[model samples]
Target chain A: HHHHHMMDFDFLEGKRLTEDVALDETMVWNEDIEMLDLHLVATSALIGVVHRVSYELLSRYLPNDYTAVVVETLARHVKAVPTGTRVAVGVRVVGVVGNRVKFRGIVMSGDEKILEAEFVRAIVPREKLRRLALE
Target chain B: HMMDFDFLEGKRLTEDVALDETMVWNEDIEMLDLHLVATSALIGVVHRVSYELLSRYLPNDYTAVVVETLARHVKAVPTGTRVAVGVRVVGVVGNRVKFRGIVMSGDEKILEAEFVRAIVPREKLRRLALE
Candidate 1:
C-alpha cells in the first residue's frame, strides 16, 4: 500500500503565503474560438483559474532540483461568475506527503463565494520528470 | 459545448474535441512532455456532460449551475488518443442533481469523478455575474 517518498519534504510544508485578488479566467479551444459557452462563465473557466493558482503555489515550493506536477484537481462552483467579472482567488497547501503538496483553494466574487478547489501538486526529481516527458 | 442532440438527432459528436488553452495546451513545452491529459480538461468535459443531462429537466427560464467536480486522474496517456467520455445520472433531489463521470481510452479507464449541479433561474445567474 506504500512505496515512495524517499527524500526530505519538510521544506515543501510551510506557511508559503496565500494571495486573494480579483482575477478573470477563460478557456479557449486552441483551434475553435467560437466553440465555447457564452453568457455566464462556464465551470471550466473557474477550474482553469484554480489550476493557475496551483501553478503559482507550487512554483514557490519547488527548487531547481525538483519539479511539481498536477496529479489531481477538484473544483466546486457555488456562484455563477460573469464572463467579464473579476473574482477573488486564493491557494494554500493543505498537506504534504513525500514530495506531494496538496492544495485547497477558494474563488470569490466580492463578498460571495464562487468556487472551492483542491489539487495535488507532486514534486519529483528534475531529471527523472524530464526523462519521463521525453520518453 | 456542442449543439443539443434533441435538435439534430443525426449530429452525433464523434471526432470533434477541443483542446482548451487553459487546460490542455500549455505554452510551456516542458509541461506537455508529461503527455498526460490535463485534469482540468477531464473535469471540464464531465461538467458539460452532466449539465446536458440535467438541463433537459430544468424548468422554463431556469438553468443548471455546476456545483462541483471531484475527480482523480490515475494514468497518463498521450494527446492523440481516442478518448470516450460518458456520464450517468446518480440522483436528483428537486433542484439539485448528482452524476457519475467516466473517461476511457479504448477499454482502459483513465479517469472518473462525481459531478453535482443545481437548478436556478436564468436571470439569477445573469444578475450575479453582471451585478
Candidate 2:
C-alpha cells in the first residue's frame, strides 16, 4: 500500500468550501440530453467537500485512520443544474461523536442553491475492511 | 416518447447485481460498502422503479425530479456478495412519489433509504429552464 497520510481530529467545526468543480462528463443519467441525476450529484458533491476538509485538515490527526464511509444522509433539492454547469459544494461540520463526523452542505450553480444535504460518516480501519473483503 | 409501466404501489421489487471491477471502489481493496457505491446503486434502483410506476399514470412527457432522500447504512457489504435490492412504494400524492427500499445480501439488509421524487411535465421544465 502507498503511504497514505493517516488522518485524525476532534471538535472540528466550521470548515468551508467555495470552489466550482467541473461536472464529470460521465456523471449523467440521461443520454439524449445529458442531465445529471439528482442522487448522483448529491452524493458526489457531499463526498467531494468532505474529502477536501478531512484529507486536508482533519485526517493528519486521526489515529490509524482509513477513509470515512457515509452512514446516514438527508437531502433536499431546490432545483436542477444541467449536466455541463460547473457546480460548487459548500459544507460545514456540525457535530462529531467519537468516530462519526457530521456534515451539512449545499450544491450551487453560480448563486442558485440546487441541493442541500446533511451527512454522517464513520471512520473505520482499512485493515478491518480488507479482512471483511477477504471473507 | 411516453411509455408506461403499470401498477407498482405496495408491490415488492427485487434486482440481482454482480460486483464486477466496475462496481468496486477505486477498483481496489475496499469492498462494496454503502457509501462507496451501494447508496448510489440503491437510488438507481429506486429511480428505475419510480419510472415504471409513473408510466402507469402519467404521460410520456413527464420527467422525474428527486426532491428528498433519507438513507441509512445498516451493515458492510463485501465485494463478492450477490446483491439483491427490494423496493416498495409507500406513498404517491399528486405528482410526487415516495418509496422505501432495502439492499440485501441473503437475509441481511445492508442498506435502506426513503426516496421522494416529483413527476413534472416536459413543457413545464422547459419553461422553468428559460426563466
Candidate 3:
C-alpha cells in the first residue's frame, strides 16, 4: 500500500515539446523507404529527450540536481509494430522523502501506461557519496 | 547524400563472447497468439543475435554497435525476457560505421536489416566518442 498525503501532489507537465516530430504513426508504407517505420535514428533521439524532461523535474525540489545518464535505452524496430507506439511524458512533484526530493514521471501511449519510474535526488556531501544511505 | 546501410552486407568477423547463448530470441504473443506473431521486442532481440554473429565476419573491418530506442512498445516489456542476439560489424570509416541485423522464426525470416552505427572511443573522448 502507498501513503496518501493531505496536500496531494502536482507539478508542471509538458505537451508536445519535441520540436521535430516524425513517425510513420499510421503504419502506412512508404515506397521510397520501403520499411513502414520511423527512422531508427529519430527514435533513439526521442529516448534522450524523455530522460532530459525527467531530470528537469527532479531538480526543482532537490537541493542537488541529478542528471540521467542513459545506461542503456533501446527499442525494437520490427516489421510488425504496435499501432499506438506514440508516447506522451508528464512530470509531477511526489513530495519530499526525508532530505531527498522524490519526483514521478509517467510515460503513456494513449491511455495505457508504458513507462513509469520515480527518481530520488538528494542533497549530500560529495565525499560521503561513496557510502550508501544510512537511514 | 545516400549513406545509410539497410541491406544485408557482412557475412564474416569474430569477437569475444560477452553474452552468447542459444537463448530463445522471442516470446509468446498475447493478442496475436492465434496468428503466432511474436512480440516486437522479442523479434528485435532475435535480430540482435543475428547481427552479433555476422559481426564476426564483416568486410572493411568495421566495428560498430547498434543502440535502439525506448518507444511505447519497448517500455512495456517485463524485465528479463529470454532472447538470443548477435551483432555483426558491417564496416567502419574514421569513427563511424555500419551493422547488419536479422531475426528468425524456426527457419523463416521474422526480420532483417543493414543497420548503420558509430563507434564510441575509449578513455578521454572528444567528438569521436559521442556516437
Please tell me which predicted candidate would have the highest TM-score against the true structure: 2
| Native interface contact recovery, model 2 | 0.46
lDDT of 3: 0.35
**Each model's number of backbone clashes?**
0, 7, 17
Q: Whose DockQ is greatest here?
A: 1
Tens-digit per-residue lDDT, B40-84, candidate 3: 333235334544553444343343343332212211112223222
Docking class of 3: incorrect
> Tens digits of per-residue lDDT for model 2 on B90-126?
8777666788877777887778888877777766666
What tens digits encode model 3's per-residue C-alpha lDDT throughout A17-74? 2222223333222211312232222222333334456445444432332221122233
Worst 10 residues of 1 chain A by lDDT: A27-36
Off by over 4 Å in 2: A1-9, A31-61, B1-9, B20-23, B27-38, B78-81
**Candidate that scores best on lDDT:** 1
Residue B1, model 1: Cα distance from true site in angstroms: 26
Model 2 TM-score, all chains together: 0.76
TM-score of each: 0.75, 0.76, 0.28
